[PDB]
Amino acid sequence: DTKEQRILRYVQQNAKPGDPQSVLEAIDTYCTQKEWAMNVGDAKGQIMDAVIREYSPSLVLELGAYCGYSAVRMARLLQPGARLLTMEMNPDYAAITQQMLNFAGLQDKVTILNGASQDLIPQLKKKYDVDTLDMVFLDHWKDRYLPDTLLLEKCGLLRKGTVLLADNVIVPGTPDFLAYVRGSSSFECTHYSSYLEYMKVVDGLEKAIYQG
Ligand SMILES: C[S@@+](CC[C@H](N)C(=O)[O-])C[C@H]1O[C@@H](n2cnc3c(N)ncnc32)[C@H](O)[C@@H]1O
Ligand SMILES: O=c1cc(-c2ccccc2)c2ccc(O)c(O)c2o1
Ligand SMILES: [Mg+2]
Fold first, then answer.
1. Residue 118, exposed/middle/buried by CB under 10 A (0-12, 13-18, 19+)?
2. So where does S-adenosyl-L-methionine get bound?
3. How far is the CA of 141 from the centre of ligand 1 (A)?
4. CATH number at residue 54
């Protein structure tokens, strides 16, 4: 028995099936009252809701799924026919995320790509019929934010107005990505201050909007 499948079980025992909001709240209390996990969490969760409502993206790419919390968070707010793609390298995690999405009712909105983003991003246009992404959520290993951003730009996945939204920009930190995105005239940035999940340490999301 694994921390993640401990969470999956809590959800299946406590959330109302087919109800995304309920699933989220089961995850948040489980992680607030018993075991800490690295889900984006509710406080930054609300920021993400707001940004997605604003842009209403047709096509979203998530880097790093884990137990499915942020994928459920985002897919619940997508319009009919909009699509989330989520990359997860750990198959135990990609298996839980599927079960979590399934429970929430969101499996028709969300495609799990099992693998490592560096390998999967170049396969995106060919194997998944992607022209450009409207939004990208970055929440995988922190040393991967910049290289995957440069890789998305390289494979032609970014479009004038594509929104990159980055978790953990302060804690644990992604200094090279922040420096690159703020300094670059090809990305318009706004910082949205908040607090780490389940603990009030100051983290934040960076939104970085691709300029071409
Ligand atoms: C911080 S957790 C993601 C949490 C999720 N975004 C949420 O809010 O619920 C990070 C995940 O990224 C996965 N990961 C790390 N590096 C990756 C990579 N290069 N490609 C795909 N997945 C990766 C890890 O296996 C881990 O499950
Ligand atoms: O790779 C990590 C590693 C951590 C992490 C680093 C040190 C201790 C615990 C978690 C992490 C935390 C919160 C979070 O939202 C993340 O996306 C994280 O990603
Ligand atoms: Mg995070």
1. middle
2. 40, 62, 70, 88-89, 115-118, 139
3. 6
4. 3.40.50.150
